[PDB]
């Protein structure tokens, strides 16, 4: 009974926004949180046989919080098939190369379920080191929130 009705809004992909400048969660935690959103576990209509997750826009990713000495010491790895071609890059190095966004993305990828849907979900997450971005318009926004 309950499942019957117009279900179009449930399975609508919302765009969420997280300002990492105004969020005090440290990297990993934040990533984990994002993962849930991506999967769509937050919504009661979720079923594992279905990608129903929302879009997440992360902005000001340069101000992400990383604890301890991880910025210097935390090493990301990449291997071709060819022996001797192990690349090991420190987080800072990676940031310099690509950006904090990349870091965040990696974490999210790690978090996510390892199946076909993964890649799509990952791509749903849009990250920007600084503030500006092309999705400003499409973040979910209510009419009552317009006091500011």
């Amino acid at each position: 009974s309950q499942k019957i009705g117009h279900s179009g809004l449930a399975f609508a992909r919302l765009w969420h926004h997280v300002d990492v400048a105004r969020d005090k969660r440290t990297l990993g935690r934040l990533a984990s949180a994002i993962a849930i959103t991506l999967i769509g576990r937050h919504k009661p209509v979720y079923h594992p046989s279905q990608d129903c997750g929302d879009y997440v826009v992360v902005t000001n990713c340069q101000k992400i919080r990383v604890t301890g000495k991880k910025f210097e010491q935390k090493t990301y790895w990449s291997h071709s098939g060819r022996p001797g071609q192990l690349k090991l890059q420190t987080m800072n190095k990676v940031v310099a190369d690509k950006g904090f966004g990349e870091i965040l993305k990696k974490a999210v990828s790690g978090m996510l379920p390892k199946n076909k849907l993964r890649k799509q979900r990952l791509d749903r997450l849009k990250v920007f080191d600084g503030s500006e971005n092309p999705y400003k318009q499409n973040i979910t926004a209510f009419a009552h929130e317009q006091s500011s």
Binding site: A12, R13, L14, W15, Y55, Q137, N138, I139, T140, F142
Partner: protein
Amino acid sequence: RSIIAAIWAVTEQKDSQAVYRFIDDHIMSRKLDITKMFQFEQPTRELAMLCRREGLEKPVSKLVAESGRLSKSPVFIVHVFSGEETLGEGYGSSLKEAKARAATDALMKWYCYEPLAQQEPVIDPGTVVV
């Protein structure tokens, strides 16, 4: 039909409503969603006309919430206000669509109104004509 007729014939005097009861048990017990029967041309106009007929401020569609503009599948929520009383919520992938939906919803509300048995038999002023 004949069976019903026969029933009526036998119970015309001893229990007049018996036939009706039987019919209800059999014919009227069957599910029909009345919501699935409608199909509107341009409902906004109709809604406006209805408002005019009644004692209502002119209906205006307004954006309540919006997400995913600039995307394959956005969501726009528009209500059709009459002053303050919201007359019909309407969701849509486009603004236009949302507006249309709101109007349709309003129309449905107007029509499919189902009053209680404790109320005094309500009689409508027919159908809206435009």
